[PDB]
Every structure is written in structure tokens, then in C-alpha cells.
From Swiss-Prot, chain A:
Entry superkingdom: Viruses
Compartment list: Virion; Host cytoplasm
Protein name from the UniProt record: Capsid protein VP1
Organism for this UniProt entry: Human rhinovirus 2 (HRV-2)
Subunit and partners: Interacts with capsid protein VP0, and capsid protein VP3 to form heterotrimeric protomers. Five protomers subsequently associate to form pentamers which serve as building blocks for the capsid. Interacts with capsid protein VP2, capsid protein VP3 and capsid protein VP4 following cleavage of capsid protein VP0.
Function of the protein: Forms an icosahedral capsid of pseudo T=3 symmetry with capsid proteins VP2 and VP3. The capsid is 300 Angstroms in diameter, composed of 60 copies of each capsid protein and enclosing the viral positive strand RNA genome. Capsid protein VP1 mainly forms the vertices of the capsid. Capsid protein VP1 interacts with host cell receptor to provide virion attachment to target host cells. This attachment induces virion internalization. Tyrosine kinases are probably involved in the entry process. After binding to its receptor, the capsid undergoes conformational changes.
Swiss-Prot record, chains C, D:
Protein location: Virion; Host cytoplasm
The name this protein goes by in its record: Capsid protein VP3
Superkingdom assignment: Viruses
Function: Forms an icosahedral capsid of pseudo T=3 symmetry with capsid proteins VP2 and VP3. The capsid is 300 Angstroms in diameter, composed of 60 copies of each capsid protein and enclosing the viral positive strand RNA genome.
Cystine crosslinks: none
Transmembrane region(s): none
Swiss-Prot record, chain E:
Function: Forms an icosahedral capsid of pseudo T=3 symmetry with capsid proteins VP2 and VP3. The capsid is 300 Angstroms in diameter, composed of 60 copies of each capsid protein and enclosing the viral positive strand RNA genome.
Protein name: Capsid protein VP3
Complex formation: Interacts with capsid protein VP0 and capsid protein VP1 to form heterotrimeric protomers. Five protomers subsequently associate to form pentamers which serve as building blocks for the capsid. Interacts with capsid protein VP4 in the mature capsid. Interacts with protein 2C; this interaction may be important for virion morphogenesis.
First and last residues shown, out of full length: 450 to 508 of 2150
Subcellular location: Virion; Host cytoplasm
Provenance organism: Human rhinovirus 2
């Protein structure tokens, strides 16, 4: 039954986020940096798996797979800077924001031809577990469902080089892996398509409710 | 037999063939798990008694009902006041569901206690459930066909989807008990506090959610063709913190 | 310093690897853990929980609680055979149950399943139902007689509203493929040994429920992606 | 030589890593260390030092030592409520104090705070001040009565110019976010139980000071950049 | 005095001296009371305690 352990079921790594960055000539800063609030609910397959429990706790392993594509004019050598901003810390909003050189944040530099970047994160919440579901409300009595203690921080990325920029595309697949997993209070599996993040909503406009249950003509014939 | 707890006492509880949610018995917050180091003490048997809600009517067309805890007891004497005059609180419960019927009635109920039962909104689009509707109080929430207000605030009515996108019939993964009229006529669940933190704002977060779905429709040849479902809830090891002045 | 030789595979990122990695927040001391009731440690725990089988999966009852029950008649002219279902964990209707759902997340399974039935009738309603199992290889029974000639149970409802029967593991190989088979699957058939008998002033019909869970010997291997959930939507935040 | 396998992450520069590195001045023997008084080893040491709270942070006294004191009246017509302040370490006015400043350098905090008061009056000036704490959740008191109905202290100034009261840690989670909350924050309110009583030929008013420090149980976690200091200048050398 | 198949749940409540008798089922159950389930037990007793300022009270 070893392969049926939580560690085996949830501990597998998957692509939780695709991050694309394109060199833009107009302004140096522009919106060249990319910021993403870490969330494992974006991928349905991954979501349904975790939503099999009410509360989960685990450490993380982030692996980054950079994919550079040069349309033309070389620009082969470019240095990438991936940064992790902890929960509550201010996120960058310009390619040259101070956040990029702050020491409270964690950054990893990657130049093509280098091994894929990788680092670990400990259990981040202020609570003892992450909420897969939340029958509660905000302090303002709004945005019910989402939990503030569940914040996991942000993954940021900026092109560090300066002018060698010749309009090149950067694809960064982000792989996450739950380590030392623990779960509480199993729930029935999700039976319908997801429609919103942080909401169990299932009703879709102008479409009938469709389950996994396949109907048969007569119950006397299997 | 009868379980007399406090100044309240409910007859017909009988033997102890009840279910103990997740196998854990309601307990007082241990100092090791406590949030603010430890509190000198929290012993108060005052809120530990039976609050019996009004009996709901089970008819041949009833699709379901659900209450949320602690919400349902927000207006029940001591417990209600306690949770209103304190910032934080935690509590377990002893839900007791029983209905009066005869050997000439047939039907079956699924009585489940769901942790973090996050409801899904009725409409499509970027809508969400509004505070007022997930906090119906002791009145509970009945599955109705009639149209209601702030529709985009209303929760779903799809009971067979557990009100949250899962399949009824898998709802058995939660602590529950079936009530097969021809066998038993009551169920009992003793649930401990469940959350990712020691205590919480009882006002904003409903830990448990009591659901009751008629899996097998009620049928009978009696004059009145409906029977009553009586619900008695009793707080277990209730604890509170951050007390504020009352009657002000 | 120390002579080393690099092995084929170095620097590669194998998505199923298992190596250490530097902590990005080395100084941060994570929130202590507290005692939350209901810790799950193995999926087998979920598979041993009886869940209702949508036995009546027809178009008429498809999206209602009626798909979970079968209606038993008291009239002398109701066909002998009541309902039938294949025993492969991943086949319909079993598929959408707890054990079926977890099974769809793997490729190989093995073990025995436990079917339980509940009579949703009146306290004075009695009947004798014949529950029969048919091993893989042969086509499901077509008459009450054929059914009772094989392994079965004459369940007398009056006085006992519940009964369970265990479907054994019959296979060539140790584990079998998680995908449903017809010739390699068993059958569970339910028959009227007698019709519903009732006193006066009593509902002429009564419902029947069906549950299923795996046994101690139930086990899964080689995880894959469930096919019971297909996400082709926005998932807009 | 020795077969090795390179792991994902090699050669990367993680700004929070912790590895050895060659010494650039291997032969240099650094100056010996001498005994300098006042070694600090933990920031908690700084947090346990009482510092004045700029209790009177209005536009009138904003950049003067008057922002650190409150003036008590002896006249019968001064409003019952004297001053009020939230108890969250990072909220104004506490923010700019010692413990507030160090707290702004982290994201999570926990523990009890210790408020101390000093009566800057005359040796013959006496008065009874009501110091009350209000737990998070409820709006700060509005009348002397409401205030004394909760936890409080009737501090009689004559004969004891100082007094301290400890605000306990009341929170859902173990540590709370370092950012100020209103509904999740407590209140410290000061009221006149009696006005200032004085003999003849004596200043009709007297000042009041307010201090704050953390207790033994005070603690911080997950360092971030203080927001109490924003550098948008040259810093020309 | 019902039939052997007749069942019901009656709420028997006591109200101490000083306050006016309850007016709603809820108020009644918020005080001392008993949810007596008739089916299976045709009898039940409850004891009204002695609550008085003086030892004996006027008849």
C-alpha cells in the first residue's frame, strides 16, 4: 500500500504555473518583470487531488525550467533573475524596483546552459495547515471561501541584462512538489468542472449539469 | 433512556450507538496546542446543555435541510451570549437527530456532519454566497423551488451535489448516520472542534455544517402524511477568549 | 582535490527525481503543528468507506437522489430480475463511488469488494430478495433459477434491514488493469424470490439502497490521471 | 575517480544559500577581539526596553517633545476620556517606538506587551486615572463606566508616580501578521476617575508619559523590510 | 393516555417564581425543562424544587 500513501499521491511534482516574459523596446522597465502569487489551485487536475481533503500541510520544492527563444539578432547570452517574495512582503512593480535587491527575499540567478534552478520552501501559513475549503468569511464579511492564512508568497522574474535585448521570448515552467505531506478530513471527489478559484461554484451558463455518471437504457442489463 | 445534561434533559436517546466524528472525543484545548502560550484555565459547564431547535416537517417532497455550527446556536441562551461577547471561541458538539414515526411509515435520512462545508452559489458567472444566507441561524436552510432575493448571493439548491459540486452518495466519507425508519428513528454524532487553529471568530467561520438529505422519500398512508424531525444540539468543551463588557 | 567522474544523467531534471535542495527561507521557523482530528495517511482508508452506488443510472433519474435507489414492487407481475451491475471497480455505476474514484487514479487494482444493501421499506413490509454473484467469464444470469444455482444469498428483509456480501478476487494475474472489462468482469444480480408483502394501509412499494467499499486486501498500483474528471473550462480566478 | 551525479540546482546562486568559500586573504591573521561592553545577541533584547510612545501625535505637537506627553487638567469640565491608542505593535503611535521599529522588520509577531505610565505632576498633585484595556473584536469604550466594566485599573497617582499593565496575547493563530489591524486589534484607553487635585500656588496642569516594551513571550518571525523608513534620496558621499 | 402506536414529543418546563410564565416553545426550553418522548414510555415525573426567601412560606 506504499504507493497509496499521501506522500505518493500528493508528493508528485507538477507544473503549477507557466510564466511568459517578452522583451519590450518602448520602456526599459515597462512590465518586463513578472509577478505571480503562488497558488496550487490553478490546475484542475492538481486541484481536485488536493481537494480530496479539508486541511493539508507540507513543505515545497520549486524547480524552474527556463525556455529562451530568439526570433533573430542573436542575444544568446542573457541572465535571468527569479525571486521569491514571502507572504506579506511588498512585491516589485517595475523592472528596477528595490525589491529585486532586498535581502529578506530569496533570489536565484540563472544564465542559459546552467542546471535548472531549484529551491525549497517550508510550511508558510500562520495556521497549522492550509485550508482546502473554508466555510468562513472575510473580516469585512465578504469574499467568503478564500482564507488569508493560506497565502504562500509570489514568484517574480526579470531579465537582468541591459541592451543586448533584441526582442526575445522567455518561457518559464514552474514545477512544484509537496514534500512531507499531511492531510486531514477526506471529502468526496469533485464531480463537476471548476468555474472559479477559491469557490465551489459549478453552475455554468447555458449548459446542463454534467456528471461522470454514464447513463444506461435499462438497469437489468449491466 | 434519557440524557439529562444541565437543566435540560432529552428522553429517547437510549444506548450509546452514536458516532464519534473522526474517532476523536471532544476535548479542552491542551496548553501545548494553545495559541497564547497557555491560559490559566477554562472550566465552565454552564454552556454545556441541550438546545432543541424547532422540529422541521418532513414531507413526501422534502429534498433536504442544512444548518451551520456554531451559527445555529447564536441565539441559544448562554452559549449564544458567550459567542457574542467573546472575540474567539472553540467548541465541539453532540448533535442528536430524531424523528417520530410509526411502523407504518417508511423513509430514510442521511445525517451528515461536514467540516468546512463551503457552499457553492446558485448562479453562474462571477458570483459568490452572501453572509446572510450562510448564517440562517436556528431556522436552518430548507431546499425550496421558490425564487429568492439577492439571487447572486444565494447558495445552490442542488442537494444531490452536496451543495458543493460533489456527489451525494459519497457524502458518506464524512461522519454520518443513516436513519432508516423501519430500523432506527434517531442518530447521534459527537464531534470535536475542527480547524487549522486553536480558536476562531465564531461569527465569521462555521466549522461544522449539519446536513440532512432524504435519500429514500417519506411514504405513508396516514391522515397527515408528514412526520417531524427534532434536532437537539449540545456544546462540548466550549471555550472562549477575549471577553467584552455586556449590557453596555 | 577529490577525483570525480560525471555520470550520464547529470544536470538533467527528471520530474520524478528525489534530491535535496537549498531552503529559500533558512531562518524561518514554521508554525507549530496542532492536533487536527481525522488525519489520513493512506488512500486505502478512503477506499474502505461504504458509499452509495448510483445503481439506477438511467436518463429518468440521472441527476437526482433517485439514481441511488431501486423501487421494489409488491404487485405479482413485476419482472423477476430487479437490477444488475458489473463488479469492476472502474465500470459504471461503481466508477463514481468513493472506491471507484480513487481507483480511477491508478492503473492496477486487486482485492475483494464488499457490497452492502439496505431495505428502505416499512417496518411491516417483508420480502425475500436473491442476491447473486457471477464470476468473470460467463454472461450474467437471465432467470431466477440460473442465478440461485450459482453463488448467492436468499436475504429475508423482515427483521434485518441490512446485509453484505463479499465479491472475491478472481484473476489470472495478481493485479488487473484499472480499465473496465466485460469478459473479465463479474456481475451482481438482484432477484425477487418473493414480491413485497405488506399489511393494509401501507405503501405498495419500497426503495432499496446499494453500498460498496474495498476490503483489507484491496490495493492499487501505478498512479495515472483520473478520467472521471475532465477539465475543459476557464477556471478564471 | 569517484562517480558523481549532478543535482538540479547546481551552479545556481541562491541569495539565501549557505556554503563555504575560499578566503581571499588566507594568511592574514585578523585583529584580536577585545571586551567591548554591551554586546547584543538577540533583537529581543532591544524589544524589552521601554520606550516613550508618541501618544500625542497630532499636528500641533508633531515635531516636538510634546508629542510624548498628555496634559491632565484639574478643571471640572475636561472630557472624561483622556487618550486612546491601538495595541498592535505596528500601528501608530506605537509604530515608531523601539519595539515597533524592530517589529516593522518582520512579518509575524506574538506575545504580550507592557505599558508603563509616569505621572509628571507635582509632589502634591494627586489624581485617580482609569487605565483600561479592550480586547480585539469590540469597539473602544465611549464612557468611563463602560471602560471600568471591562478589565482596568484605578491608578491613584499620589504616592506612586508609576504603574504598568500587561496587554495579553489574544489571537486565533499563534503568530499574527505584523501589519496593523483594526478589528483584530486591542485598545488602551485612559480616563479621569477624578480630576487633578492640587493645593494653592500649584500648576493647574500636569503631564503624563507612556512607555511600551515587549514581555518574555514577545517574539517575531519572517523578516521583511521595514516600511517606517523609505529612502528616496541621493545619499551622496 | 394515547394509543400504543401514537407517538409525540412534549416539552415539560418549570419556571421559577419571579418571572412570568413562558410564551413561546423556545423561551420555555431555554429554562429548565424536559423533552419527553412518549413512544415507549407512557410516564414521566419531574420534581419542582423549593425556592423561597423564608424556610416555610404562607399556605
Amino acid at each position: 500500500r506504499d504507493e497509496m500513501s499521501l506522500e505518493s499521491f500528493l508528493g508528485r511534482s507538477g507544473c503549477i504555473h507557466e510564466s511568459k516574459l517578452e522583451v519590450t523596446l518602448a520602456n526599459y522597465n515597462k512590465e518586463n518583470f513578472t509577478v505571480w502569487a503562488i497558488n496550487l489551485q490553478e490546475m484542475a487536475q492538481i486541484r481536485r487531488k488536493f481537494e480530496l481533503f479539508t486541511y493539508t500541510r507540507f513543505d515545497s520544492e520549486i524547480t524552474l525550467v527556463p525556455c529562451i527563444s530568439a526570433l533573430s539578432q542573436d542575444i544568446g547570452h542573457i541572465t535571468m533573475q527569479y525571486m521569491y517574495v514571502p507572504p506579506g512582503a511588498p512585491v516589485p512593480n517595475s523592472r528596477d524596483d528595490y525589491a529585486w535587491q532586498s535581502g529578506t527575499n530569496a533570489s536565484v540567478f540563472w544564465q542559459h546552459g546552467q542546471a535548472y534552478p531549484r529551491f525549497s520552501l517550508p510550511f508558510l501559513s500562520v495556521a497549522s495547515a492550509y485550508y482546502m475549503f473554508y466555510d468562513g468569511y472575510d473580516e469585512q464579511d465578504q469574499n467568503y471561501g478564500t482564507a488569508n492564512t493560506n497565502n504562500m508568497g509570489s514568484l517574480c522574474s526579470r531579465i537582468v541584462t541591459e541592451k543586448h535585448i533584441h526582442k526575445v521570448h522567455i518561457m518559464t515552467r514552474i514545477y512544484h512538489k509537496a514534500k512531507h505531506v499531511k492531510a486531514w478530513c477526506p471529502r468526496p471527489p469533485r464531480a463537476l468542472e471548476y468555474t472559479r478559484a477559491h469557490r465551489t461554484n459549478f453552475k455554468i451558463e447555458d449548459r446542463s449539469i454534467q456528471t461522470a455518471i454514464v447513463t444506461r437504457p435499462i438497469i437489468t442489463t449491466a | 433512556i434519557q440524557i439529562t445534561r444541565g437543566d435540560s434533559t432529552i428522553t429517547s436517546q437510549d444506548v450509546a450507538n452514536a458516532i464519534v466524528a473522526y474517532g476523536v472525543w471532544p476535548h479542552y484545548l491542551s496548553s501545548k496546542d494553545a495559541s497564547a502560550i497557555d491560559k490559566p484555565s477554562q472550566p465552565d459547564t454552564s454552556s454545556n446543555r441541550f438546545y432543541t431547535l424547532r422540529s422541521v416537517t418532513w414531507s413526501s417532497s422534502s429534498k433536504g435541510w442544512w444548518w451551520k455550527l456554531p451559527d445555529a446556536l447564536k441565539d441559544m441562551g448562554i452559549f449564544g451570549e458567550n459567542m457574542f461577547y467573546h472575540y474567539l471561541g472553540r467548541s465541539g458538539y453532540t448533535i442528536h437527530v430524531q424523528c417520530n414515526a410509526s411502523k407504518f411509515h417508511q423513509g430514510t435520512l442521511i445525517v451528515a456532519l461536514i467540516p468546512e462545508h463551503q457552499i457553492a452559489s446558485a448562479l453562474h458567472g462571477n458570483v459568490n454566497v452572501g453572509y446572510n444566507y450562510t448564517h440562517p441561524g436556528e431556522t436552518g436552510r430548507e431546499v425550496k423551488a421558490e425564487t429568492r432575493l439577492n439571487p447572486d448571493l444565494q447558495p445552490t439548491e442542488e442537494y444531490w451535489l452536496n451543495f458543493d459540486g460533489t456527489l451525494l452518495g459519497n457524502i458518506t466519507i464524512f461522519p454520518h448516520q443513516f436513519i432508516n425508519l423501519r430500523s432506527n428513528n434517531s442518530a447521534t454524532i459527537i464531534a470535536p472542534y475542527v480547524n487549522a487553529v486553536p480558536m476562531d471568530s465564531m461569527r465569521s467561520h462555521n466549522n461544522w455544517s449539519l446536513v440532512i438529505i432524504p435519500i429514500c422519500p417519506l411514504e405513508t398512508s396516514s391522515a397527515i402524511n408528514t412526520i417531524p424531525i427534532t434536532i437537539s444540539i449540545s456544546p462540548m468543551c466550549a471555550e472562549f477568549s477575549g471577553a467584552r463588557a455586556k449590557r453596555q | 582535490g577529490l577525483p570525480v567522474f560525471i555520470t550520464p544523467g547529470s544536470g538533467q531534471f527528471l520530474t520524478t527525481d528525489d534530491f535535496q535542495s537549498p531552503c529559500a527561507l533558512p531562518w524561518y521557523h514554521p508554525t507549530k503543528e496542532i492536533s487536527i482530528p481525522g488525519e489520513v495517511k493512506n488512500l486505502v482508508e478512503i477506499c474502505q468507506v461504504d458509499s452509495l452506488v448510483p445503481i439506477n443510472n438511467t436518463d429518468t433519474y440521472i441527476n437526482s437522489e433517485n439514481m441511488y435507489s431501486v423501487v421494489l414492487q409488491s404487485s405479482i407481475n413485476a419482472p423477476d430480475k430487479i437490477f444488475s451491475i458489473r463488479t469492476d471497480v472502474a465500470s459504471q455505476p461503481l466508477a463514481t463511488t468513493l472506491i471507484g474514484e480513487i481507483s480511477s487514479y491508478f492503473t492496477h487494482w486487486t482485492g475483494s469488494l464488499r457490497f452492502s444493501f439496505m431495505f428502505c421499506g416499512t417496518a411491516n413490509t417483508t420480502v425475500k430478495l436473491l442476491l447473486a454473484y457471477t464470476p468473470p467469464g460467463i454472461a450474467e444470469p437471465t432467470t431466477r433459477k440460473d442465478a440461485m444455482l450459482g453463488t448467492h444469498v436468499i436475504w429475508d428483509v423482515g427483521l434485518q434491514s441490512t446485509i453484505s456480501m463479499v465479491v472475491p478476487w478472481i484473476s489470472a494475474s495478481h493485479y488487473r488493469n484499472t480499465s473496465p472489462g466485460r469478459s473479465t468482469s463479474g456481475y451482481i444480480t438482484c432477484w425477487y424470490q418473493t414480491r413485497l408483502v405488506i399489511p393494509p394501509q401501507t405503501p405498495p412499494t419500497a426503495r432499496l439502497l446499494c453500498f460498496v467499499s474495498g476490503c483489507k486486501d484491496f490495493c492499487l498500483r501505478m498512479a495515472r490521471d483520473t478520467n472521471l474528471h475532465l477539465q475543459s473550462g476557464a477556471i478564471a480566478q
